[PDB]
Amino acid sequence: RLEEALELFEEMKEKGIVPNVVTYTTLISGLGKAGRLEEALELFEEMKEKGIVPNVVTYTTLISGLGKAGRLEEALELFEEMKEKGIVPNVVTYTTLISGLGKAGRLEEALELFEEMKEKGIVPNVVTYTTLISGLGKAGRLEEALELFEEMKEKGIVPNVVTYTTLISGLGKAGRLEEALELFEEMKEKGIVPNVVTYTTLISGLGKAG
C-alpha cells in the first residue's frame, strides 16, 4: 500500500510533524522495490539532511537498485560511507556489488570483495557464485573459475546451466576434453538441459581428436 503511505507522509509533513527513521526506512524500502530509484534518493537527501541515522536496510535497498541501474561508482560511494558509519553489510549488498563489478569487468576488486565478505563471516550464494565463476571464465581465468566452482559445490550450492556452459566452453577451447566430458556427464546427472554451445564445442573437440 505504498501510495497511501506516501499520501500520509505528505499530510504528516504538512501539519509539521517530525518523521521518524522508521517511517523513512519503510518508505525507502517500498520506493526501492517499486523500482522508482531517484525518488528514494530525494528521500535519502531529506533523511541525511534532517540528521536521521539510516539502518542497514536503507543502505541495502539503495545499493541494490543502484547496482541494477549500473551506477556502480555511486553504489560504491554508498557502500564505503555505510562502512564508515559502522553499518555492517549483508549478503545482498555484496552480491549486487560483485555482480555489478563483474558486469563492469573490474574483476580483481570483485575478488577482494568476495574475500572480504567471507572474512566478515558472510555467506555467499548461488548468485554470488555463478556470477563470480562466470566472471572468471569470461576473463580467461579458467583455473580459478574451476577452483571456485568446486568450492561452490563444497558448500552444497547447486550451480545452474550458466556455470556449466561457461566452464565446458572454456575447457573445450582449452583442449582439456576429458574433464569437459566428466562435467558434461555430471551436469546431466542433475537433470539440466545443456546449451547449443556446449554441444557444438564438445562435438568440435571430440571430432578433432580420436
CSV table of C-alpha atoms in Angstrom, one decimal, residues 107-206:
chain,number,residue,atom,x,y,z
A,107,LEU,CA,37.3,-8.3,-11.6
A,108,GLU,CA,40.1,-8.1,-9.0
A,109,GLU,CA,38.1,-5.7,-6.9
A,110,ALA,CA,35.1,-8.0,-7.1
A,111,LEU,CA,37.6,-10.7,-5.9
A,112,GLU,CA,38.7,-8.6,-3.0
A,113,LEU,CA,35.0,-8.0,-2.1
A,114,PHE,CA,34.4,-11.8,-2.1
A,115,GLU,CA,37.4,-12.4,0.2
A,116,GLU,CA,36.2,-9.6,2.5
A,117,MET,CA,32.7,-10.9,2.6
A,118,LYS,CA,33.9,-14.3,3.6
A,119,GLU,CA,36.2,-12.6,6.1
A,120,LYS,CA,33.3,-10.8,7.8
A,121,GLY,CA,31.7,-14.2,8.1
A,122,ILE,CA,29.0,-13.6,5.4
A,123,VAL,CA,27.6,-16.5,3.3
A,124,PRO,CA,28.0,-16.4,-0.4
A,125,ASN,CA,25.1,-17.7,-2.5
A,126,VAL,CA,24.3,-19.3,-5.9
A,127,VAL,CA,24.1,-15.8,-7.4
A,128,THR,CA,27.4,-14.6,-5.9
A,129,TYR,CA,28.9,-17.8,-7.1
A,130,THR,CA,27.6,-18.2,-10.6
A,131,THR,CA,28.4,-14.5,-11.1
A,132,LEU,CA,32.0,-14.8,-9.8
A,133,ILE,CA,32.7,-18.0,-11.8
A,134,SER,CA,31.1,-16.7,-15.0
A,135,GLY,CA,33.3,-13.6,-14.4
A,136,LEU,CA,36.5,-15.6,-14.1
A,137,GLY,CA,35.8,-17.8,-17.1
A,138,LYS,CA,34.8,-14.8,-19.2
A,139,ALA,CA,38.2,-13.3,-18.5
A,140,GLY,CA,40.0,-16.5,-19.4
A,141,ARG,CA,41.0,-17.2,-15.8
A,142,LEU,CA,39.7,-20.8,-16.2
A,143,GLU,CA,41.8,-22.3,-13.5
A,144,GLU,CA,40.4,-20.2,-10.7
A,145,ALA,CA,36.9,-20.5,-12.2
A,146,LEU,CA,37.4,-24.2,-11.6
A,147,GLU,CA,38.6,-24.0,-8.0
A,148,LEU,CA,35.7,-21.7,-7.2
A,149,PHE,CA,33.3,-24.0,-8.9
A,150,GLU,CA,34.5,-26.9,-6.7
A,151,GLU,CA,34.3,-24.9,-3.5
A,152,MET,CA,30.9,-23.7,-4.5
A,153,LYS,CA,29.7,-27.4,-4.7
A,154,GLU,CA,31.7,-27.9,-1.4
A,155,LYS,CA,29.1,-25.7,0.3
A,156,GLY,CA,26.3,-27.6,-1.2
A,157,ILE,CA,25.3,-24.9,-3.7
A,158,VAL,CA,23.7,-26.2,-6.8
A,159,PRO,CA,25.1,-24.5,-10.0
A,160,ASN,CA,22.8,-23.8,-12.9
A,161,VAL,CA,23.3,-24.0,-16.6
A,162,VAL,CA,25.4,-20.9,-16.9
A,163,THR,CA,28.3,-22.1,-14.7
A,164,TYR,CA,28.3,-25.3,-16.7
A,165,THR,CA,28.1,-23.9,-20.2
A,166,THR,CA,30.8,-21.4,-19.4
A,167,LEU,CA,33.2,-23.9,-17.9
A,168,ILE,CA,32.6,-26.5,-20.6
A,169,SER,CA,33.1,-24.0,-23.3
A,170,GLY,CA,36.4,-22.9,-21.8
A,171,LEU,CA,37.6,-26.4,-21.2
A,172,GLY,CA,36.6,-27.3,-24.8
A,173,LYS,CA,38.5,-24.4,-26.2
A,174,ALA,CA,41.4,-25.3,-23.9
A,175,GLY,CA,41.7,-28.9,-25.1
A,176,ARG,CA,41.1,-30.5,-21.7
A,177,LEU,CA,38.4,-32.7,-23.3
A,178,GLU,CA,38.4,-35.3,-20.6
A,179,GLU,CA,37.3,-33.1,-17.8
A,180,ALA,CA,34.8,-31.2,-20.0
A,181,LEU,CA,33.4,-34.7,-20.6
A,182,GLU,CA,33.0,-35.8,-16.9
A,183,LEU,CA,31.5,-32.3,-16.3
A,184,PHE,CA,29.0,-32.9,-19.1
A,185,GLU,CA,28.0,-36.1,-17.6
A,186,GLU,CA,27.8,-34.6,-14.1
A,187,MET,CA,25.6,-31.8,-15.4
A,188,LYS,CA,23.3,-34.3,-16.9
A,189,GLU,CA,23.2,-36.2,-13.6
A,190,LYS,CA,21.5,-33.2,-12.1
A,191,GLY,CA,19.0,-33.3,-15.0
A,192,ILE,CA,19.7,-29.9,-16.6
A,193,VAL,CA,19.5,-29.4,-20.4
A,194,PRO,CA,22.8,-28.5,-22.0
A,195,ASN,CA,23.2,-25.4,-24.2
A,196,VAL,CA,23.7,-25.4,-28.0
A,197,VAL,CA,27.2,-24.0,-27.4
A,198,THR,CA,28.1,-26.9,-25.1
A,199,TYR,CA,27.0,-29.4,-27.7
A,200,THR,CA,28.8,-27.8,-30.7
A,201,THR,CA,32.1,-27.1,-28.8
A,202,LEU,CA,32.0,-30.7,-27.5
A,203,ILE,CA,31.5,-32.3,-30.8
A,204,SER,CA,34.1,-30.0,-32.3
A,205,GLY,CA,36.7,-31.1,-29.8
A,206,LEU,CA,35.6,-34.7,-29.8
